[PDB]
């Protein structure tokens, strides 16, 4: 009954999705073939007529190399033949070839499939989108989608997971451009945008865990569990539950301010775990620690405005209350002036599920802290500056104006990210 459609736009989306879907298949016992050897599956899967629980997701990527791997692999049976969608060429790290050229060609098939997946649902409760600002599909095709779903499912919340341009580590040279031009056309359409960089999660893999040489695979599995923790209340049982809509209404202040972060709690390796207690107090405090955040943005350089401590497992409601009280005292963690509470909680009586072949341990407790910090302005100002430096000498702008995009769009995008900055300042000021 309470179902949520997950859309994977871009290499990232698919790669991270091949990790998120693996976990779901395990939590709700569904073997790769798609068979369950009672109703928790509804939130994510949909039963056919012969135990063929088929994922309620849509995987789209213009370039057919990442989705072809899914088609020829373990989950070749799970995913519906036509739920995996491809094209021919790529957006070649260019927003234009995803929001103006190639994109158009695939938007009326991706959209038609979402409709079919939403018409078989009885309670669509949200559209989760897994994009990657840097790419042209994770910035362009995702803009088309969010600029379309808005004019088709206005009320339906549209939460958004997003690999954000990491501070210094970056792949493409035009990532600065794609990101700015895409926030302009996604800030007014998404409800809340969960952001995770790559620098931070890389560190969390080496230190907190024990994985030297961490790859995308590892990163995607921790992002996978953040989704499980958020969607758990909608599929398992708990003491204080929290549905998709209840996230936004307790996390998004002044409309535009809608860019929360994500920190897991028991990100410990096997050897280490055994030698540790992992109590509500510990995992809670570990979450607020400025070296467990997954978007390098020194929490201390700003004020939190609405945290959402979503727990999972053995969490005695009392310990939770106590733990959060402690956090309020410690002044390092400073909240704003217009948010006395700013602590929506949530307990789902379902222990974290070990991905047979992951890196995390069998912890019987976890918390996923979604915080609306005002420190993300630093990160946003960084990308903003990069733009200016390149745009000054109209750098890679010939490539963007050839696939459809006036030089004006660049200017609006810059002046609009400037508004984002100004807003965040006028939300940190006191009364």
């Amino acid at each position: 009954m309470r179902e949520c459609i997950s859309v994977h736009v871009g290499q990232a989306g698919v790669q991270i999705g091949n990790a998120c879907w693996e976990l779901y298949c395990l939590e709700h016992g569904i073997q790769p073939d798609g068979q369950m050897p009672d109703d928790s599956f509804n939130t994510f899967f949909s039963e056919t007529g012969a135990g063929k629980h088929v994922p309620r997701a849509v995987f789209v990527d213009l370039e057919p190399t990442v989705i072809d791997e899914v088609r020829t692999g373990t989950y070749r049976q799970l995913f519906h033949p036509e739920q995996l969608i491809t094209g021919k060429e790529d957006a070649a790290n260019n927003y234009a070839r995803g929001h103006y050229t190639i994109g158009k060609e695939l938007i009326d098939l991706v959209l038609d499939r979402i409709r079919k997946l939403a018409d078989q649902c009885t309670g669509l409760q949200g559209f989760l989108i897994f994009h990657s600002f840097g790419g042209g599909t994770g910035s362009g095709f995702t803009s088309l989608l969010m600029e379309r779903l808005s004019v088709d499912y206005g009320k339906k919340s549209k939460l958004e997971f997003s690999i954000y341009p990491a501070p210094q580590v970056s792949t493409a040279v035009v990532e600065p451009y794609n990101s700015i031009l895409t926030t302009h056309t996604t800030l007014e359409h998404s409800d809340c945008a969960f952001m995770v960089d790559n620098e931070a999660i890389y560190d969390i893999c080496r230190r907190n865990l024990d994985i030297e040489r961490p790859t995308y695979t590892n990163l995607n599995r921790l992002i996978g569990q953040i989704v499980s923790s958020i969607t758990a209340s909608l599929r398992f049982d708990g003491a204080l539950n929290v549905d998709l809509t209840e996230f936004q209404t307790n996390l998004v202040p002044y409309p535009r301010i809608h860019f929360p972060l994500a920190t897991y709690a028991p990100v410990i390796s096997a050897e280490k775990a055994y030698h540790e207690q992992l109590s509500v107090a510990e995992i809670t405090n570990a979450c607020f620690e400025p070296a467990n955040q997954m978007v390098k943005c020194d929490p201390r350089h700003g004020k939190y405005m609405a945290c959402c401590l979503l727990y999972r497992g053995d969490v005695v409601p009392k310990d939770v209350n106590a733990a959060i009280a402690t956090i309020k005292t410690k002044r390092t963690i400073q909240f704003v002036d217009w948010c006395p509470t700013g602590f929506k909680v949530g307990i789902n009586y379902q222990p974290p599920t070990v991905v047979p072949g992951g890196d995390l341990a069998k912890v019987q407790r976890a918390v996923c802290m979604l915080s609306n910090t005002t420190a993300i302005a630093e990160a946003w100002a960084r990308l903003d500056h990069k733009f200016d430096l390149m745009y000054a000498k109209r750098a890679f702008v010939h490539w963007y104006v050839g696939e459809g995009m006036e030089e004006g769009e660049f200017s609006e995008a810059r002046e609009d990210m400037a508004a984002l900055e100004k807003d965040y300042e006028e939300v940190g000021m006191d009364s």
Partner: protein
């Protein structure tokens, strides 16, 4: 025992200009075109054929 109808077969073809509009309030059908200019000779005998179905995403479109 029920028989598959033409309401089913015309649905995966996509001829119907309908989608299950998910209101929080309830279940309504969003119409992409005006209902007044619809060809009533093509749709009323076809929407009545969908009454025989009992699975949710097809019986609702017949009922509403």
């Amino acid at each position: 025992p029920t028989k598959p109808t033409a309401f089913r077969k015309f649905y995966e073809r996509g001829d119907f200009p309908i989608a299950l509009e998910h209101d929080s309030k309830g279940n309504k059908i969003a119409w992409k075109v005006e209902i007044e200019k619809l060809d009533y000779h093509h749709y009323l005998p076809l929407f009545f054929d969908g009454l025989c179905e009992m699975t949710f995403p097809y019986e609702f479109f017949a009922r509403q």
